[PDB]
Amino acid sequence: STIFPFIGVPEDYILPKTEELPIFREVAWDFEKDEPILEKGDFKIIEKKEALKVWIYKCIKTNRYEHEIYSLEYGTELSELIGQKYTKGLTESEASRFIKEALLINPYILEVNVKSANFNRDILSANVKVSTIY
């Protein structure tokens, strides 16, 4: 509480720690049945990339302003595109922006890219690449 590190730190002084995030861990989830997974009569815990997959799935699957429990940041506005309310190019731009802005609130996710986009009948397809710290 004595040092003044704003101009420079003293040579003898040791920095307490380097700031890093803990290992991301989450209750495992199965996607074809939409349930948590029980292992030996208890919830099964996964870590790192699989936990991030679970979180991403949950974030994409929710609507933005629908629920009172969530804040204004959590969710996705992809439900406003159903029915071709906008033109096709505007729909592509909006979808890309929506997905990027929704995913980038997690501190463990570094960059999101929506590369491909195709229109076939009433289906819109896209490829999303997520880069994490791991």
């Binding site: 049945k33 939409d34 349930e35 948590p36 949950k58 629920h67 429990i69």
Partner: protein
Amino acid sequence: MKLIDKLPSFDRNYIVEEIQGAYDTELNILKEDIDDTFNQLFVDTATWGLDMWEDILCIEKKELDFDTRRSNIKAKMRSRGTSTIEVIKSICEAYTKSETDIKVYSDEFTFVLSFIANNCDYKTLLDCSDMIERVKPAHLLHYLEPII
């Protein structure tokens, strides 16, 4: 059936449903207890909070019934302060739960309280008479007139 409505639609599995139903029942218990505690704050509706009224009014009694306790408390509040015809009538009706008419004899120094006692017991009448005797001016006679 109520807490599950605040969650997105993928949370409709049985595990989440049980977890939320438990808190549903718990919160119902909490709100019913709050309702009961609020209801205890009125003299008429008080059942297990009457002892707080006794502690306020410094009256010590042996537990007999709810109605008797409420009547004693109410008559204690009504007797305080100015004493007139209407105060005595109010005490007599608080005990006898009915309309009361008083007739006064100035020459004989006597007054009579008349009321309908089709649903009044002897013990409560005796308690009312004792209350009146404590409240009534010393020089006056008091007679009861239960009309059946």
